[PDB]
């Protein structure tokens, strides 16, 4: 099974924003071979923000 679809509109836009941010201001550790727990964490932060 596959939950994340990194080719759609919203996922690709979010990933492009993250890539621009990481180009300008580095993160702690890169996202080499992106997993799905990263997407779940992003969605959880968005859930807390929305609530």
């Amino acid at each position: 099974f596959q939950l994340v679809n990194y080719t759609d509109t919203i996922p690709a836009r979010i990933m492009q924003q993250w890539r621009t941010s990481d180009a300008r201001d580095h993160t702690r550790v890169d996202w080499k071979r992106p997993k799905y727990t990263s997407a779940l964490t992003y969605d959880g932060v968005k859930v807390m923000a929305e609530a």
Partner: single-chain antibody
Amino acid sequence: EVKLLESGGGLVQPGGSLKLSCAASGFDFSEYWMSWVRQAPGKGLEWIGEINPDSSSIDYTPSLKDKIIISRDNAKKTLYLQLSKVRSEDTALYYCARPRGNYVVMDYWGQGTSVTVNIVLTQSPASLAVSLGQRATISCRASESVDSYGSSFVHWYQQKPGQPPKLLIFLASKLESGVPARFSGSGSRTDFTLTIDPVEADDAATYYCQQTNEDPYTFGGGTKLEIKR
């Protein structure tokens, strides 16, 4: 390790717009965004343009933004920068580079060429010379912090005149891949340091400490290294 090709360095006519062929061979500029930097003779490099991987929106140099426009395409993996009102000092060595943030092997800048039409740091010692097999430790003092966003956010580019610059050490945790250099960022590094051991005739070049932790990435003065016979 991605490979780049940049050829055609030649003068132009007064103001005659120019363009350089920066081909990203064996890879695509969608996995590592392509950025064009500009280094004059005997001076630190300057970011001429930062582009996007998905070919959505590119930037321009913070010095003269509207003065130049650099087009590029991910699938084509070929970029071309243009400008107008070309002056003498405007003819500086422009070089393409891939995004180093993806991997260490991705930090593979193009060849680079010149024509005849930030970051603050100081590396020491400026005049260094040791025989083959020696261990050299250069210290690059700075004014900003020594680590940004968890780990270190400084790098060291091993450039040579007319040769493609290479990024040996970066972020004190990811040294140059493919050809692992014995020198790399280490320790707390209040001043960026790398203990090259053992040196060789191939590892003799100008090491310049450019810290990405101080916006923007600007190559500093650096320290010279040779092969003392």
